[PDB]
Design a protein around this ligand. Structure first.
Ligand SMILES: [Cl-]
Ligand SMILES: [Cl-]
Ligand SMILES: [Cl-]
Ligand SMILES: [Cl-]
Lengths: 509, 509, 509, 509
């Protein structure tokens, strides 16, 4: 009954996967914890099994990673970059089958699974350049005969906890940067994407092994809240990068702060698109649809709030209706499918409860709102009108494809409505007004970490720092100087002179 | 019997001080809370009184500061820089009386009180330049017809909590940078330095009023832990900069994390100086004496651990003893005085407690150890030998002039002994070895935020970023790109093209 | 007869000017060269006299400046910044009287004379911040045990040759930046603003002398082409900053290149405003007027070409013509005056020659074109329509208030017409079209050094780099990283390891 | 008789080379100029022939390249980076055979020919990262409602003239950076390395053609001084990067300045090693040998002057002499060979003249000094003692393996003697003294663009900017912000407000 035991899925063997897989890697492969079975959300058929990390597995792995760091931190950053370049090449070689596994185990369509691996590849190639660039300024000291330099050094062991919905590229972006910065990494992925975690780790392990480097530089301990909480409380985890829900991230951030650790938090979003009266509606309508229903509404940056000016609200909603009707639904591997299932049955129960709450909170379901009659966790992409902007269900992140539509009249109020929620990840306005565009980007504009113009809430690329404000947690990944989160700054004064301090009346010999 | 009503202290009136002072400023002066009397540590005499903030005062002041932010954030940063320049000039015009008050109320010697004001002056002129420079990169978007920009905007209200021992410069450094970054500020100083806080706030308030700006841009609510806790829990305080003990700062850090606020923590130190065998002892001995006993051992960056190579240990300890005996003790404002009192009677009890605890833990007092038989809170600067590097009392920050002296043999063990404590503020090696110097600055070297060579643990200037790692809290102030902690980053994609998204098989209108 | 000997000009003595002034400063004041008398262009009366440098004066001054450099380069940059800060304050003290001398000797209106001194004051404060920031990155070496650092050091003597039209701020921007970068300076200003050069040098000389520094750090050798050509050919002039005509600067740049010196060239402009059909016309018309007629059309950044979409050309011409008729003309020191005289009588002749040449090339004078019937060098601000965009006089820089107006239809042609001239200083479009704006700023847009949107060609502040492309010379001044032009970069590899090179089969002892 | 027509050289076919090769590439391959034969400098045998560019070929190619630029500059820089990434992979595929061609046509040993191709590969991977990073800052405008941005755009066509001695890497470093910066390129390499230029261009042309890009993006016009001069005079060549002798470079720099073009000059070197009394002589001697004789003395960074403290002078000379005698001479493809031929018989003649002249100027040949009796252009590596530091022949770059040795006593004199020559490329001190090291790196230290400590004059890596000062031409290649030389800066003010200019008394509409 395991999919991996069917000849239809023998391609999984190109990733080194078997019926039962080792979920711990620290140079060697193991796993003494519970055996977890992951399921394909398009049909709820079991794929394969992974033995997770026990507490003893975790302790062994943290110890091995930290010993490996003594070797890794001594390797010049450009030479660390060369390792990451080879990881990028190893991913390219497997991009089709790795992408297919993301689609199989996670549920997003194949082009998005392939594209997520491509993003990991691209950030490896970016990090290769960074490995010759990271550092700080030499500054002019006010003291004659002294140097003043800003040094950056690795923090040590970087723990990386990741969510189900980007089960490759979040780890990859953290891993590529943390590596060139001279850190070792320990990955605990979402339990429901355990096979992806193993497969990616097998690819990296082979590159480390081929370069005669200890594999614990990129360690893996598959587990759930038990292992994740251990990482949050473990003083040996110098930086904990956590991508996940706000509810969990809040508690992790506390536990790290309690031990004076460092955290990088990438939490929830409740992202708004705003269409002003002057917007190109031929741009707004497709932008809102794809941002709202992409990955079946399971991106951190999914559009969940759509503010439309009064004079165009009805036309935009009607055009969005005629468009949603053409969303093509199927298995995420099926060619030319735009829309697959939700990741779990629990997300379906969350979807239904949200549609119900919205309907009872005064909203009207103008499209969707129902479960589809088919195997897997399929729900209709949903649009809801008539809610107040402060409706409770619209302030909540429901990780499903529900787009709440609101009317507005004026700029100042709709900017405030963007900002009024607790999340602060992504935000978008559609307009042609030069003045409004620069106010949106200024101090009285959007309060989010991603602030877009005429591109929806998923508009991001690896060149910029990625992350959100407020309850999204403040962390940044990928571009700009995000690399500084993975290193420690020191401000260093070097007296190279023979000058003695002033004696101040004291007689020194 | 107030010092301010005596003719010798008439100069206090040049700071605008009176017998009883209002300790709340927000555009208006006030204070309905408890009236505190502050005392001169040189003679235990009361100086003057300050009416502190009630809860109502705090509430009104936070509201007024955030209303003023609407005006202040709209002022272009170079014009905010011009205000900070004028603050710098207002400080210059009062530097002698203000530095005299620092000596009087806090107890450090006059040149250090005056020096502390000069530091604030210097950061203002630094910030004037920064006000024409802050911002982020325009980056090359991978998308045709798109721009990609990193924007920086004020966080809003920056609450600033400061310690007794740098009662002017810590606030000033936060103030100048937060101001040019577009924030309004709210200051709660240490209660035992309330008159200094009032005096500084009067100088700034005149500059704001003279420029027809709302005074709440730089608000003041004097108080103790009750006001500080309110700030730590208050979602309207967008950034809380806290300078103080690790014990208090850990709870402030957790309160801010609880509400997904931002914190900048500048906490405890336990700084080591390391003298290798090849060191210039005519540099080592004065450097250690001054870093250990300056400000009566009450700098965050005070030298509290002294590692001496075993070949030179005895010579350096005996030269230190002979140098300690020549320290000139007296009233902090008197000429040629190098050593004044501890800040509080309580600190004297802490001093004796540590001296007794170190004797129990096997240490030998080779100089000092007792309270001085004279008015004020004067204790002898103390040298303790024979302790193990891992003695508990040596791992503890005792904010008193006690120097723990250790032997060592090799570089690796003594670097680890530097890093083994929970604090991570400042550190110094004295050596001529080129390779040792660059290992100390590298990944297997010092883990502190300040890493010095041939200058002691108080070597730091405003051009670099100032702060520590580990239990020192991680925040940075003053120079380099410390300014980014007072602002929020956004990654902004602007589609300026008329290109439509790919239809992906959907028939849009 | 000499204006300085008349009571109503006694304020000149506040700048330290006499009937006859020394034009050479190197610590001493001298001048064995030709005595020049400078005239007031508003009444053609002589002001005072300056004794210019002889060759012996020039030789002696270069030697004294390079000797002073030995002291000046040893002063830490932040302390060099403190000298520059004091220059800014010294200029602040004399801003009104200095701005009035600029108006008297050069002819610009008082608010622009004062504003010029203000711009020098502003770049001084900017340079104070820069003096704690200049430097290069520490970079990660690919070689184990090596450091890789980019150092920046002063080039030595920076010669500064300036033009008549900005006789304070061009020097000041070069001076303040060169000084904090550790260079000494040698100034040769325009001969017709010799009194301004002497007055500025007297202000700086006092600051240097008061700070016990050698005055040759900011040397002055007043003179004409012969002194300027000497500097161009002098190997001891490590960097020659030249501001002037394209015709002279081309020969200066060739002479410096011949000796492998460094040159910073700030040459002519032929700056265009482009108004598209969607432009805000209440913005276009005043922006065009003030940018065309400001400083009597004698700015490097003066608008000389106005491209107007065919649909709005006649309306904009008619509205400019009605606004030109209200320009208030008079003595440049009277505060109601917007429009002062041209700098010389030859300038008036060349104005008339250009008007005549425009008529011969087919152009129609729709406003102005004639000399004003009053004492001084006053001409009417002039608008010419009907020329083709490639008319020879339209491609010539004529330093007079003549605005050539052209029709256009489409964006691509009018961008090409902006770029077709040999000059490449400033350029501006007025439009609301978001895409047009970013195309103008991109690779197929303006080819100029200053590229503005909805602000005219005179829009520039000190925070950015200032300069042009093509025949404008490529130099940059003031902001961003323009400071690098005043320093020499070194890429420095430091082997701090004990490792030996590979023997490669050679037995070394 | 052609080597490519002999069967032992069939590997040259792997590079696409044949008996007679087209030396023009612009999308099509051609060449109507003179047919050049290139010769193996190890045996003077002809290898193959290249058809060089006529003037008509040049004209057509410039035109086609500027046409290609219209497409290329519209490609987002990260996507141009992907093209450069593919160039790096294509070079990897041919690195052994391309390295072998470098040894065969140019004459450097095999590890260095491969090492040269590797350097290009590394700069490609660097450029890939830079392609998501290049740009300038957003700056805070002093004007309300305005943005201030620094934009960087390609200059257009970058002509690249390269020298014989790094026939792959100098072009590749210019090409990789210029390409990601949005420029098209036109290469004219040295005529004596034409086959290498063709081989590299074939590798790039396949990548461009496989990506359906116009091949003129990387154009090739093989030829001599005629083609090179045409490039220096050609206004359509927006930037001319010239690597070669100072003698030719000076004339190129003058021709480019005459037309207000941009040049990037990488000219001659006269690089000194300085050994202080405290140096590690086990590091000094092999460092001096390999830096003096590597590449048969034909690096721009070759050590040509060796200053030794008089206390250790005789010891280092004696030890250097014993190491020189072990240098292994032979065919540069022979794996056991350290030392191959000079590039041309004219190089041998120049070598002999310089040796003859060092004797006439009072020097003593203590090792070498003779041409070797064998086929090819072999000369003995040579050591000359007893010359004055200012001997004319020692101030001359002779591109040959002659090492002039000098005594010195004190630091200040020997720093001056490093700096007294007209060249300014690389420099090295060997010392342990911390203060001497930081003085070497400061304002009174080396005046060169490369300033090294305990590593000889050839110590550089791609992460840093590479180039020299004074007669070395001032240009920079490769790392840091060298990319700025391939682009044009604009400083851009964008008024997005509806604020109108102040009327200044004028009544507008
Ligand atoms: Cl001593
Ligand atoms: Cl539609
Ligand atoms: Cl040897
Ligand atoms: Cl008008």
């Amino acid at each position: 009954t395991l999919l991996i035991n069917q000849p239809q899925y023998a391609w999984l063997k190109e990733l080194g996967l078997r019926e039962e897989n080792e979920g711990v890697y620290n140079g060697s492969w193991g796993g003494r914890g519970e055996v977890i079975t992951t399921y394909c959300p398009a049909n709820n058929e079991p794929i394969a099994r992974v033995r997770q990390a026990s507490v003893a597995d975790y302790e062994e792995t943290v110890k091995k990673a930290r010993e490996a760091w003594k070797i890794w931190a001594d390797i010049p950053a450009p030479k660390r970059g060369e390792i990451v370049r080879q990881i990028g090449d190893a991913l390219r070689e497997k991009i089709q089958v790795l992408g297919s596994l993301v689609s199989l185990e996670m549920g997003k369509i194949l082009v998005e699974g392939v594209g997520e691996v491509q993003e990991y590849v691209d950030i490896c190639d970016y990090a290769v350049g960074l490995s010759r660039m990271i550092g700080g300024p030499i500054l002019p000291s006010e003291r004659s005969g002294h140097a003043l330099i800003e040094q950056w050094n690795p923090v040590g062991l970087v723990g990386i906890i990741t969510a189900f919905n980007f089960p490759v590229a979040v780890y990859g972006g953290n891993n590529a940067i943390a590596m060139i910065c001279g850190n070792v990494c320990l990955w605990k992925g979402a339990p429901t994407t355990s096979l992806i975690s193993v497969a990616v780790t097998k690819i990296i392990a082979k590159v480390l092994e081929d370069n005669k480097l200890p594999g614990a530089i990129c360690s893996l301990t598959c587990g759930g809240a038990d292992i994740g909480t251990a990482m949050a409380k473990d003083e040996r985890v110098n930086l904990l990068s956590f991508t996940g829900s706000t509810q969990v991230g809040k508690q992790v951030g506390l536990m790290v702060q309690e031990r004076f650790g460092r955290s990088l938090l990438e939490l929830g979003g409740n992202n708004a698109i705003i269409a002003f009266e002057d917007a190109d509606l031929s741009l707004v309508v497709p932008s809102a649809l794809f941002a709202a229903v992409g990955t079946a509404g399971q991106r951190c940056t999914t559009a969940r709030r759509l503010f439309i000016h009064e004079s165009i609200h009805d036309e935009v909603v009607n055009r969005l209706k005629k468009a949603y009707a053409q969303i093509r639904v199927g298995n995420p591997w099926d060619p030319n499918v735009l829309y697959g299932p939700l990741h779990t049955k629990q997300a379906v129960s969350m979807f239904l409860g949200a549609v119900e709450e919205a309907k009872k909170e005064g909203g009207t379901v103008v499209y969707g709102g129902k479960v589809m009659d088919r195997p897997g966790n399929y729900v209709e992409p949903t649009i809801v009108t008539g809610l107040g902007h402060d409706a409770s269900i619209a302030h909540t992140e429901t990780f499903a494809p529900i787009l709440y539509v609101f009317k507005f009249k004026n700029e100042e109020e709709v900017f405030a409505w963007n900002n009024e929620v607790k999340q602060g990840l992504s935000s978008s306005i559609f307009t042609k007004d030069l003045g409004r565009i620069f106010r949106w980007l200024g101090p009285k504009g959007s309060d989010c970490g991603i602030v877009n113009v005429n591109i929806p809430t998923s508009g991001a690329e690896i060149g910029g720092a990625f992350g959100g404000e407020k309850h999204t947690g403040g962390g940044r990944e990928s571009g700009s100087d995000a690399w500084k989160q993975y290193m420690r700054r020191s401000t260093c004064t070097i007296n190279y002179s023979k000058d003695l301090p002033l004696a101040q009346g004291i007689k020194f010999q």
